[PDB]
Amino acid sequence: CCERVVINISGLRFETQLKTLAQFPETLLGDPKKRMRYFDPLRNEYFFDRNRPSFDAILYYYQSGGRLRRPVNVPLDIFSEEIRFYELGEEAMEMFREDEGYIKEEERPLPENEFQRQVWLLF
Amino acid sequence: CCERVVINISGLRFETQLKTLAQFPETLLGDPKKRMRYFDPLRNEYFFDRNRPSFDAILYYYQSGGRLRRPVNVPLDIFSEEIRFYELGEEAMEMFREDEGYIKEEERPLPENEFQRQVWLLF
Amino acid sequence: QFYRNLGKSGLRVSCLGLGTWVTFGGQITDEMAEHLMTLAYDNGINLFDTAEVYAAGKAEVVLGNIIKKKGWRRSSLVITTKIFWGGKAETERGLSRKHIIEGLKASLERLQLEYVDVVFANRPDPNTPMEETVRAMTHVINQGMAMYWGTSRWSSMEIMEAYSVARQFNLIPPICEQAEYHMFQREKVEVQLPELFHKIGVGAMTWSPLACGIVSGKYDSGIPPYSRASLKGYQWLKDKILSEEGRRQQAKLKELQAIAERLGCTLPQLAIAWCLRNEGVSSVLLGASNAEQLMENIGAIQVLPKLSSSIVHEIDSILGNKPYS
Amino acid sequence: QFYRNLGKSGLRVSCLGLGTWVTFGGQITDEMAEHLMTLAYDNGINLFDTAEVYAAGKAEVVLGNIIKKKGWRRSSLVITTKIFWGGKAETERGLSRKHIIEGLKASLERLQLEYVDVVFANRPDPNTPMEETVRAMTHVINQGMAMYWGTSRWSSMEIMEAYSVARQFNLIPPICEQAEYHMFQREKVEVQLPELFHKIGVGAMTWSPLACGIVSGKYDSGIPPYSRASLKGYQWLKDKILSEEGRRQQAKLKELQAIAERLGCTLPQLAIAWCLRNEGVSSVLLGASNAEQLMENIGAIQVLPKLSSSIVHEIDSILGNKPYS
Ligand SMILES: NC(=O)c1ccc[n+]([C@@H]2O[C@H](COP(=O)([O-])OP(=O)(O)OC[C@H]3O[C@@H](n4cnc5c(N)ncnc54)[C@H](OP(=O)(O)O)[C@@H]3O)[C@@H](O)[C@H]2O)c1
Ligand SMILES: NC(=O)c1ccc[n+]([C@@H]2O[C@H](COP(=O)([O-])OP(=O)(O)OC[C@H]3O[C@@H](n4cnc5c(N)ncnc54)[C@H](OP(=O)(O)O)[C@@H]3O)[C@@H](O)[C@H]2O)c1
C-alpha cells in the first residue's frame, strides 16, 4: 500500500506507489512474477534499458487509471513498440489506435462456398 | 552484458548495460580505449560536458540497434556536431541526412581531358 | 551437499541444525547436553541455535560451558541467538536500540563468546520504527558482536520493509528468516518465502520440523510420560494434540506410516527429509532429548535421495494442505 | 628509483619483495629464515608477503618471531597477508564475512602484529556475493586490522565488479592485484592489468618471477637434489618440468643464456629485470632458499638500466609468446 516502487528507465528514476502498479495485474509492471527479472537488488529498483521519453506516458497510464496517450516527441513506431513491451494489453492498444486514428478494422470475409468464396475475390 | 555503465552528460545521468554500447565497437562509447579519457573514477561514471538533449537520441541509437533520429527541440547544426563527436560513423551519418533530406550527392566529374575537362566547365 | 549457503550469503551452514529450545537447560541435564552436542558436532552439524528467552537465560549458559569444555574452535561453529525478551522490565523487551545492544551484550557473557554468527530478531516489534531496528542491528555487526543478522516470524512485507531501509541508509540487510515449517504448516515457506529468496536473497532456516514432536507419531495412543506434552507449563501442546483438529492429524500420520514403510525410513526421518526437499530451505533446526532421537534424525539425510517426485506427490495427497500461490 | 607506489595508492613499496611461500616454515630452517630477512631488510626491501595457508600457518609464525627478535620498526615494514583457506571446516574457507574477520584475527596472533598493511583475497569466491566481501574487507580496515586490501587471481571483471560495489555503498576499493608474471605467463599483466591501472588505479604485485625456479635454468640436466621440484608434495612441479611442454621451455632458456652473457647478468637476474621493465608492475615477490640466491636476485636492479628497447625485442623473439590486445 505505502510501499514505494522505484523504476529506473536507462538512468531516469520513476518512483511510484505499489498500489498504483497493482491496479493492472496482467501487465509487466503489475505482475510481480513478470517484473522479477528486472530487479536490481543492490540498488533496490527495477532497471529497464529501454526508451526514456516513452515511459512517462506509460507511468501516467497507471496513475490516471487507464488514460494513456502518446507524447508529442515520441513517434508512433517507437511508442507502439513500448506498449507491446510493457504489456498494456490487446484492449488498451485498441483504445490507443482509435485516439490515434489508426483504425483499420477491414476484414474481408469470403463467401465461404470455397468457390463462391473463390469467385468472389475475383470480383 | 550484465554490467551497467553510467554516462553523465553535464549532470544528466544515463545508465545502460555494457553489452548495449559494445554492439557498435568503432564509436566513442563502444571502444574502451576511446572512452577511457572520460572516466570519472571517484564517481564510477563517464562524464561528458556536452549538449544535454542530444544524447537521448544518441543513447537510443545503441538500444534500438541503429535507429537514430533527431530530437524535435535540437536543431540540425547542434545535433550534427554531436554525431561527429560520438563518432557514429560516415555510414550512419548518411542514413541520417537522407531521413533529414539533406541529400546533396552532386559531384560534377570533369571530362578528364584537362582541356576537354577545362572547356567543359566553361559550358 | 550437506553444507549449503544461508540465503545468498557466504555463510555455509549444515542442512541440519541443533536447537536448545526446551531440552537444553530445561528438560535434560547438563551431562546429556554435553553428549548431544558431541554427537552432533562429530556428524558435521555446525549450526547451534539458542535464545535469551530460553530457560530464563540458562540455555545459553549450558551451551556456553560446552564450547569451553570441548575446546571446539569458534571458527568451525555457527552460533546463532535470538533477541526480544530480556526480562520483566519494560525496557527489556522489543527491538529497540537499547535492547538489541544490551541483550546481545548480555547473551555474549552467558555464552562466553566474543561474538555470535547470526543474531535474530525473535519476533517483530510494532512499537519501534524499522530504522531503529536496522540501525541497531547494523551497529552490533560493525562493533563485531555479530557477523550476520536475520529475522524470526516476520511477515514478508516486514522483511521487505527492513530491506528497503538498509538500502536507503547504507545499512546491512538481513540474510535469513526463521519460519515454522513442517507437514502441517506450509503457507509461509512455500508461498511467501520463495518470492523473497529470488528477489532480495533471504533464505529460510526452518524450525520445528516435527511440530514439537507430534509428527514423530508418538502421541497416537494418548500422552506418553516423559515427553514434552507432559512437561510443566506446556498445556498448550497437550491442548493441541487432544483437540479434534489435533486428533485428525494423528489419523493422517498413520497413513504416513505406510509411506515410511515403503522406504527404509521412519516417520521422523521422513518428516525432516520432506522439509529439505526444496532449494529454498537453507537449514532445519532439530530438537532432540536423547541420543537415540538425534542419531535417528541425522539419518534423514540418507532418505533425501530416496524421495522422488512421486513420493512427494503421494504425501501431499495424504496431507491435503498444499498452498496455492 | 627503487621504491615505487602500489597502484595509485600512497603505499610506497620496494620493487622487490620477499615471499614466505615454501621456503619459510617449510623448506629452510628458522635460522636461515632470520638470515634472509636481515639480508633483505638491509638492502632496502620492505615488502614481506605471507599467507595463512602456507605451512598450515607455520610460515606466519616464523615471520612473526623475526620482527620481534630483530626489533624492526613496524613503520618501516610492509607486511602483507592472504586470506582464503583457514582449515578443514566448511566455515573456514572462502571470502565470507565470517572468515575474513575471523581469519585475519587469527593471522594477527601468529604474526604477533597489531595490523597488516595489505590483506589479500587469495582467490575469488563464487559462493559469496561481492557486497559481503567488500563490506568485510572495509570492516577490517576501519577496525584497524589492515590499512589496504588487494585481490589475488581475480579476473579483471571481478576486480571491476568489486570496484563498482565500493563506489555504490561508499566502501573501500582494492588497491592491488597479485598475478603470476614471468617469461612464460604474460596474458594477464600485459593485457588485462594495464587497462585496470589507467581506469580505476589498481597496480600489480607480481609473484613467481622465475616460475618456481624453472627460469633460473637449474632444471636443464634433469631434477637436481635439494631443489623445490624434489620436495615432498611437489609432484606437480616435477610433472611440469619433465613434460614435453616443459622440456621445450628449457630449450628456450639455453637461447636466453646467450643474451644473459651479452649483458653482465645471469639468467635469474635477467628474468626479474624483465618483469620490472614496465611501469604497470608495482613489485615483484622473490623467492629465495639461501643467501646466494637472494644476493643474486637483488642484483637484478642493476640489470634494469641495461635493458634497452632492443634487448626486449630480442628476448620476445626467443620467447615467442607475446600477447595481442
Ligand atoms: N521462534 C523461534 O525462532 C523458534 C521457536 C521454537 C523453536 N525454535 C528452534 O527450533 C528448535 C526446536 O524444534 P522443536 O524442538 O520445537 O520441534 P522438533 O520438531 O525440533 O521437536 C523435537 C522434540 O520432539 C521429540 N522428537 C524428536 N525427534 C524424535 C524422534 N525421532 N522420535 C521420537 N520423538 C522425537 C523429542 O523428544 P520429546 O517428545 O520427549 O520432547 C524432541 O524433544 C529449538 O531448538 C529452537 O532453537 C525456534
Ligand atoms: N597466489 C599467490 O598469491 C601466490 C602464489 C605463489 C607465490 N606467491 C608469492 O611469490 C613468492 C614465490 O615466488 P616463487 O618462490 O614461487 O618463484 P621464484 O620464482 O620466486 O622461486 C624461487 C625459488 O626457486 C629457486 N631460486 C630462486 N632464485 C634462484 C637462483 N638465483 N638460482 C637458483 N635457484 C633459484 C630457489 O631455491 P630452490 O629451487 O631450491 O627452491 C627458490 O626457493 C612467495 O614468497 C609468495 O609470497 C603468491
Side-chain angles (χ1 to χ4, degrees), chain A residues 1-101 109 111 115 120-123, chain B residues 1-101 109 111 115 120-123, chain C, chain D:
Chain A
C1 295
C2 314
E3 184 161 353
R4 283 168 57 184
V5 170
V6 178
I7 296 165
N8 190 4
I9 311 296
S10 290
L12 189 51
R13 258 70 171 204
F14 288 91
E15 309 180 19
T16 332
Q17 284 156 343
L18 181 63
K19 67 180 182 291
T20 296
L21 298 175
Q23 192 179 6
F24 291 142
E26 298 184 359
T27 65
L28 184 141
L29 295 172
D31 197 0
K33 189 66 69 176
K34 291 180 182 179
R35 64 185 182 186
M36 185 68 78
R37 73 176 69 252
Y38 299 102
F39 184 71
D40 190 4
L42 291 175
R43 297 191 184 188
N44 194 6
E45 71 180 5
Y46 289 127
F47 180 72
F48 296 97
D49 195 2
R50 294 301 301 251
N51 182 32
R52 175 175 294 197
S54 64
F55 194 77
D56 194 9
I58 301 298
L59 187 64
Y60 187 73
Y61 176 77
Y62 291 94
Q63 297 170 352
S64 65
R67 288 185 286 169
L68 87 161
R69 58 184 294 159
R70 185 181 59 85
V72 292
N73 59 358
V74 183
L76 192 70
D77 56 353
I78 288 175
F79 186 71
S80 176
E81 293 176 354
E82 294 289 326
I83 304 169
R84 289 174 178 175
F85 177 69
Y86 289 128
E87 291 180 353
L88 297 181
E90 295 180 354
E91 195 274 339
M93 191 68 204
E94 294 175 354
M95 288 181 178
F96 172 71
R97 292 190 182 99
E98 292 176 354
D99 180 340
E100 198 299 322
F115 182 71
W120 173 251
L121 307 181
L122 303 176
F123 288 93
Chain B
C1 55
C2 319
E3 181 166 357
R4 284 167 57 184
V5 170
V6 179
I7 296 165
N8 190 4
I9 311 296
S10 290
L12 184 52
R13 261 136 292 198
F14 302 75
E15 304 185 3
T16 177
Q17 295 172 356
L18 181 63
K19 67 180 182 292
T20 296
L21 298 175
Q23 192 179 5
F24 291 143
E26 299 184 0
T27 65
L28 184 141
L29 295 172
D31 197 0
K33 189 66 69 176
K34 291 180 182 179
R35 64 185 182 186
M36 185 68 77
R37 73 176 69 252
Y38 299 102
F39 184 71
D40 190 4
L42 291 175
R43 297 191 184 188
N44 194 5
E45 71 180 5
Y46 289 127
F47 180 71
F48 296 97
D49 195 2
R50 294 301 301 251
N51 183 32
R52 175 175 294 197
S54 299
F55 194 77
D56 194 9
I58 301 298
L59 187 64
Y60 187 73
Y61 176 77
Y62 291 95
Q63 297 170 353
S64 65
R67 288 185 286 169
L68 87 161
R69 58 184 295 159
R70 185 181 59 85
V72 292
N73 59 358
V74 183
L76 193 69
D77 56 353
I78 288 175
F79 186 71
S80 176
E81 293 176 354
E82 294 289 326
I83 304 169
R84 289 174 178 176
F85 177 70
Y86 289 128
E87 291 180 353
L88 297 181
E90 295 180 354
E91 193 273 340
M93 190 68 204
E94 295 175 354
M95 288 181 177
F96 172 71
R97 292 190 182 99
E98 292 176 354
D99 182 343
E100 198 299 323
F115 183 71
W120 170 251
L121 307 180
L122 304 177
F123 289 92
Chain C
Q1 196 176 330
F2 193 48
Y3 292 86
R4 58 184 73 186
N5 284 109
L6 184 57
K8 296 288 176 63
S9 68
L11 186 65
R12 300 276 286 173
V13 296
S14 65
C15 70
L16 297 176
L18 191 58
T20 76
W21 185 40
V22 177
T23 68
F24 278 46
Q27 181 180 3
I28 60 174
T29 60
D30 294 332
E31 185 70 26
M32 194 68 207
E34 179 182 353
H35 182 68
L36 289 179
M37 292 191 190
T38 308
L39 186 67
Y41 180 73
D42 288 331
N43 291 319
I45 292 171
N46 57 2
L47 183 61
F48 290 139
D49 194 0
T50 187
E52 59 177 356
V53 71
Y54 294 164
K58 190 175 173 68
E60 286 178 348
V61 178
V62 179
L63 184 51
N65 288 317
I66 292 169
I67 302 168
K68 302 291 284 186
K69 185 183 265 80
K70 294 283 102 177
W72 292 340
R73 295 172 293 169
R74 180 61 186 88
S75 301
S76 64
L77 299 175
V78 177
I79 306 299
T80 62
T81 190
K82 295 187 280 292
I83 309 292
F84 193 97
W85 297 282
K88 296 288 187 68
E90 189 73 24
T91 63
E92 292 174 350
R93 289 188 298 274
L95 296 174
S96 63
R97 190 186 177 95
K98 183 173 171 64
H99 180 68
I100 293 171
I101 298 169
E102 288 175 352
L104 186 60
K105 183 64 65 65
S107 294
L108 290 184
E109 296 174 355
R110 294 192 298 271
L111 286 167
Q112 291 176 353
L113 294 175
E114 212 171 5
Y115 66 90
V116 299
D117 279 75
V118 209
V119 58
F120 281 100
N122 198 1
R123 68 169 295 272
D125 195 5
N127 299 321
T128 304
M130 193 60 75
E131 182 194 1
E132 185 179 1
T133 299
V134 177
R135 285 189 180 274
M137 290 292 178
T138 307
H139 176 76
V140 307
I141 292 168
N142 291 323
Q143 295 296 106
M145 305 179 198
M147 300 294 177
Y148 301 99
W149 74 277
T151 80
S152 283
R153 326 172 203 172
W154 272 29
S155 67
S156 68
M157 180 176 280
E158 296 169 356
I159 304 166
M160 194 66 208
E161 180 183 0
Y163 176 77
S164 65
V165 176
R167 300 303 193 194
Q168 183 59 245
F169 289 138
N170 197 359
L171 300 173
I172 298 169
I175 70 158
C176 185
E177 168 67 24
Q178 288 189 359
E180 187 178 4
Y181 184 67
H182 48 89
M183 286 179 177
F184 298 146
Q185 183 71 254
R186 297 177 70 181
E187 179 67 27
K188 186 178 177 185
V189 190
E190 291 184 356
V191 166
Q192 273 188 334
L193 282 213
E195 293 177 350
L196 259 190
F197 178 71
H198 296 288
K199 189 176 180 180
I200 68 172
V202 166
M205 184 189 291
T206 63
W207 50 271
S208 293
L210 302 179
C212 299
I214 293 170
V215 192
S216 64
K218 65 168 72 176
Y219 295 106
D220 59 352
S221 297
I223 302 300
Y226 291 160
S227 64
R228 188 176 297 179
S230 65
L231 263 68
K232 184 169 75 71
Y234 291 92
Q235 192 68 41
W236 63 272
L237 185 63
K238 191 182 287 186
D239 291 327
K240 188 182 288 183
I241 295 168
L242 294 173
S243 71
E244 69 275 18
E245 189 69 27
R247 289 173 64 91
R248 186 178 295 118
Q249 293 177 357
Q250 298 297 115
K252 293 179 182 181
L253 293 175
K254 294 179 183 291
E255 294 177 354
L256 291 170
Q257 293 288 323
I259 311 298
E261 187 178 2
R262 291 196 291 167
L263 302 172
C265 64
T266 68
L267 191 58
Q269 298 181 358
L270 176 64
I272 293 166
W274 185 79
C275 296
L276 295 170
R277 77 189 192 278
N278 289 317
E279 74 181 6
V281 174
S282 295
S283 183
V284 165
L285 293 169
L286 298 180
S289 64
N290 58 7
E292 286 85 3
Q293 285 175 356
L294 187 58
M295 186 181 180
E296 185 180 2
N297 299 134
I298 297 170
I301 311 158
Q302 302 175 359
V303 186
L304 188 58
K306 293 179 184 178
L307 288 180
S308 65
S309 297
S310 177
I311 304 298
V312 174
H313 284 289
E314 177 61 31
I315 295 170
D316 286 329
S317 68
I318 296 169
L319 298 177
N321 57 0
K322 187 172 183 179
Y324 290 156
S325 182
Chain D
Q1 67 180 0
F2 173 71
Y3 290 99
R4 58 183 73 186
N5 284 109
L6 184 57
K8 296 288 176 63
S9 68
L11 186 65
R12 301 276 286 173
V13 296
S14 65
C15 70
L16 297 176
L18 186 62
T20 69
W21 185 46
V22 180
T23 61
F24 276 54
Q27 181 180 3
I28 60 174
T29 60
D30 294 332
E31 184 70 26
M32 194 68 207
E34 179 182 353
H35 182 68
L36 289 179
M37 292 191 190
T38 308
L39 186 67
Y41 180 73
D42 288 330
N43 290 319
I45 292 171
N46 57 2
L47 183 61
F48 290 139
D49 194 0
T50 187
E52 59 177 356
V53 71
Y54 294 164
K58 190 175 173 68
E60 286 178 348
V61 178
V62 179
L63 184 52
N65 288 317
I66 292 169
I67 302 168
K68 302 291 284 186
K69 185 183 265 80
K70 294 283 102 177
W72 292 340
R73 295 172 293 169
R74 180 61 186 88
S75 301
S76 64
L77 299 175
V78 177
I79 306 299
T80 62
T81 190
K82 295 187 281 292
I83 303 297
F84 195 83
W85 294 277
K88 296 288 187 69
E90 189 73 24
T91 63
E92 292 174 350
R93 289 188 298 274
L95 296 174
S96 63
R97 189 184 175 94
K98 183 173 171 64
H99 180 68
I100 293 171
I101 289 181
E102 203 167 6
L104 189 48
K105 183 64 65 65
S107 294
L108 290 184
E109 296 174 355
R110 294 192 298 271
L111 286 167
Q112 291 176 353
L113 294 175
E114 190 183 3
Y115 60 93
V116 295
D117 281 329
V118 187
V119 55
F120 287 100
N122 198 1
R123 68 169 295 272
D125 195 5
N127 299 321
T128 304
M130 193 60 75
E131 182 194 1
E132 185 179 1
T133 299
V134 177
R135 285 189 180 274
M137 290 292 179
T138 307
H139 176 76
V140 307
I141 292 168
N142 291 323
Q143 295 296 106
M145 305 178 198
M147 300 294 177
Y148 301 99
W149 74 277
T151 77
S152 288
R153 327 172 200 174
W154 276 34
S155 52
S156 68
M157 179 176 280
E158 296 169 356
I159 304 166
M160 194 66 208
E161 180 183 0
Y163 175 76
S164 65
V165 176
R167 300 303 193 194
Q168 183 58 245
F169 289 138
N170 197 359
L171 300 173
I172 298 169
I175 70 158
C176 185
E177 168 67 24
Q178 288 189 359
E180 187 178 4
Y181 184 67
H182 48 89
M183 286 179 177
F184 298 146
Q185 183 71 254
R186 297 177 70 181
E187 179 67 27
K188 186 178 177 185
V189 190
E190 291 184 356
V191 172
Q192 288 188 333
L193 287 204
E195 157 215 339
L196 274 186
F197 180 76
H198 296 288
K199 189 176 180 180
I200 68 172
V202 166
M205 184 189 291
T206 62
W207 50 271
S208 293
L210 302 179
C212 299
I214 293 170
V215 192
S216 64
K218 65 168 72 176
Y219 295 106
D220 59 353
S221 297
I223 302 300
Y226 291 160
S227 64
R228 188 176 297 179
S230 65
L231 263 68
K232 184 169 75 71
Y234 291 92
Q235 192 68 41
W236 63 272
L237 185 63
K238 191 182 287 186
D239 291 328
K240 188 181 288 183
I241 295 168
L242 294 173
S243 71
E244 69 275 18
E245 189 69 27
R247 289 173 64 91
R248 186 178 295 118
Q249 293 177 357
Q250 298 297 115
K252 293 179 182 181
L253 294 175
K254 294 179 183 291
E255 294 177 354
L256 291 170
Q257 293 288 323
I259 311 298
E261 187 178 2
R262 291 195 291 167
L263 302 172
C265 64
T266 68
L267 191 58
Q269 298 181 358
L270 176 65
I272 293 166
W274 185 79
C275 296
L276 295 170
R277 77 189 192 278
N278 289 317
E279 74 181 6
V281 174
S282 295
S283 183
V284 165
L285 293 169
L286 298 180
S289 64
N290 58 7
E292 286 85 3
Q293 285 175 356
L294 187 58
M295 185 181 180
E296 185 180 2
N297 299 134
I298 297 170
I301 311 158
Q302 302 175 0
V303 186
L304 188 58
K306 293 179 184 178
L307 289 180
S308 65
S309 297
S310 177
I311 304 298
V312 174
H313 284 289
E314 177 62 31
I315 295 171
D316 286 329
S317 68
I318 296 169
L319 298 177
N321 57 0
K322 187 172 183 179
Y324 290 156
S325 182

